[PDB]
Amino acid sequence: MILEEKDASDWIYRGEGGANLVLAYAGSSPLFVGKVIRIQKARRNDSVLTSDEQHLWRENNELISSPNKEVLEQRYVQNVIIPLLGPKHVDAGVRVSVSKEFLECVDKKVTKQRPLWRVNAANVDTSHDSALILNDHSLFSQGSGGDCISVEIKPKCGFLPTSRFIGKENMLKTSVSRFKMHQLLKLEYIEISEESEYDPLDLFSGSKERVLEAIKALYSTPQNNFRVFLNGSLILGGSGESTGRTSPEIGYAFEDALKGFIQSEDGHRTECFLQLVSDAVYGSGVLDRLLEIQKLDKLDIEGAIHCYYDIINQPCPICKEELSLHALPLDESLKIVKEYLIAATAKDCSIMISFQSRNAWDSEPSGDYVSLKPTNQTFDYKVHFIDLSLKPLKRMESYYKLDKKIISFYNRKQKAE
Ligand SMILES: O=P(O)(O)O[C@H]1[C@H](OP(=O)(O)O)[C@@H](OP(=O)(O)O)[C@H](OP(=O)(O)O)[C@@H](OP(=O)(O)O)[C@H]1OP(=O)(O)O
Numbered sequence: 001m002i003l004e005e006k007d008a009s010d011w012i013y014r015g016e017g018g019a020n021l022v023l024a025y026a027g028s029s030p031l032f033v034g035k036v037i038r039i040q041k042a043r044r045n046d047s048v049l050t051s052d053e054q055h056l057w058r059e060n061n062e063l064i065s066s067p068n069k070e071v072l073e074q075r076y077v078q079n080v081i082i083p084l085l086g087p088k089h090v091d092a093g094v095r096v097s098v099s100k101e102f103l104e105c106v107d108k109k110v111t112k113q114r115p116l117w118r119v120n121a122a123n124v125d126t127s128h129d130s131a132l133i134l135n136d137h138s139l140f141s142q143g144s145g146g147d148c149i150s151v152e153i154k155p156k157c158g159f160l161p162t163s164r165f166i167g168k169e170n171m172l173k174t175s176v177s178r179f180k181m182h183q184l185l186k187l188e189y190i191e192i193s194e195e196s197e198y199d200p201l202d203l204f205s206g207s208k209e210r211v212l213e214a215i216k217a218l219y220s221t222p223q224n225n226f227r228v229f230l231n232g233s234l235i236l237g238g239s240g241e242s243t244g245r246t247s248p249e250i251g252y253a254f255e256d257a258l259k260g261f262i263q264s265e266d267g268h269r270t271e272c273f274l275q276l277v278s279d280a281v282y283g284s285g286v287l288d289r290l291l292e293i294q295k296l297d298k299l300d301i302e303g304a305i306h307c308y309y310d311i312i313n314q315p316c317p318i319c320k321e322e323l324s325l326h327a328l329p330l331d332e333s334l335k336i337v338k339e340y341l342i343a344a345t346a347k348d349c350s351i352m353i354s355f356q357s358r359n360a361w362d363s364e365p366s367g368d369y370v371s372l373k374p375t376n377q378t379f380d381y382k383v384h385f386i387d388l389s390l391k392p393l394k395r396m397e398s399y400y401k402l403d404k405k406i407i408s409f410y411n412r413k414q415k416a417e
């Protein structure tokens with residue numbers, strides 16, 4: 001039930017977000033085999049919910065009355081996200097008690113494998129008594145059936161806004177994806193080495209070859225959006241951070257890593273693998289449902305921000321000295337902001353697609369599979385949504401400032417024709 005210090009050596013680094021560090025199990029305890037632990041970080045940037053947050057998530061009491069942030073995250077996924085996405089592809093993760101010594105031991109144990117800039121920003125919140133055990137989807141099913149290749153995509157937002165509330169100078173937000181605009185700021189802030197080739201509009205397009213174009217793009221410039229695992233081990237993409245362009249060195253390493261799984265002449269494993277991922281993505285149409293959650297951002301931050309200030313009962317700084325939104329009932333305003341924060345979740349979650357050579361000996365042969373015509377292989381696949389985090393209400397402020405920043409910088413750069 002409780003993870004003590006000694007257990008620390010059994011977990012190895014897997015990756016990290018901005019708010020969570022993730023370790024994969026390595027020991028042999030039946031409880032944790034094929035599981036990962038998601039540990040919340042203590043940001044120096046920043047009870048379980050603010051006074052305003054209880055007001056918003058009011059319709060969902062199991063949420064507002066949570067003991068810790070771990071159960072809060074659990075109940076959010078379970079009570080808000082599942083009903084929207086389906087329980088087939090989402091698991092909320094079992095909670096577990098952890099000791100302060102365990103956490104402190106883990107933090108120091110992994111410090112060396114972490115990106116420096118990540119360490120600068122946060123460590124594990126050693127005040128928490130809890131943590132989350134999820135399944136290790138770099139392993140196919142629970143408990144085996146031969147090697148497993150899995151891909152983790154962070155697709156980000158795949159639609160263009162359409163809001164009335166987009167200002168006059170900012171109307172370029174209508175044409176260009178937020179992702180592409182944001183790339184110019186990251187590159188400006190020395191957050192990435194070169195602009196990524198990826199355009200989420202291709203991935204979400206519902207078009208077969210635009211999906212392939214996206215997967216190819218992802219492979220070329222993975223940054224923080226593309227990872228590939230072999231039996232849990234990272235074989236492509238950055239570890240808890242963005243990575244540089246796929247060089248011929250990296251490309252080759254990955255090309256080697258795929259031996260046997262994709263059954264093709266040496267050198268052609270990579271392009272066939274990409275085809276496979278593209279086919280599963282498109283076939284499953286699992287993106288369509290996600291994009292729907294995303295499109296719950298009906299009004300865009302420039303619209304929704306006005307509602308936020310009505311929620312937190314403060315004079316809206318964004319209107320100086322719109323009738324439309326500020327005349328809405330409190331009820332309607334809460335809906336808008338809630339759904340914005342849900343969309344937010346959806347825009348930052350990641351997909352895991354686990355592959356495995358079709359096992360003819362299954363008790364119930366899977367519904368979902370991809371036939372690889374050229375290599376004569378059939379692969380079974382599963383899709384799962386991960387990193388489904390509740391976004392904190394106060395963030396509404398920083399969302400607006402950030403967006404304003406992106407769109408001004410993009411306009412600024414364009415004005416140099
Ligand atoms: O720290 P990074 O890996 O560069 O990614 C951050 C981070 O996403 P993670 O959840 O993956 O860390 C932010 O979330 P927090 O961890 O700070 O909660 C998220 O912001 P929101 O999820 O609040 O939108 C932001 O995404 P965005 O840039 O869309 O705000 C995103 O940055 P990138 O995904 O652009 O790298």
Ligand SMILES: [Zn+2]
Binds near residue numbers: 306316317319322326
């Ligand atoms: Zn306003």
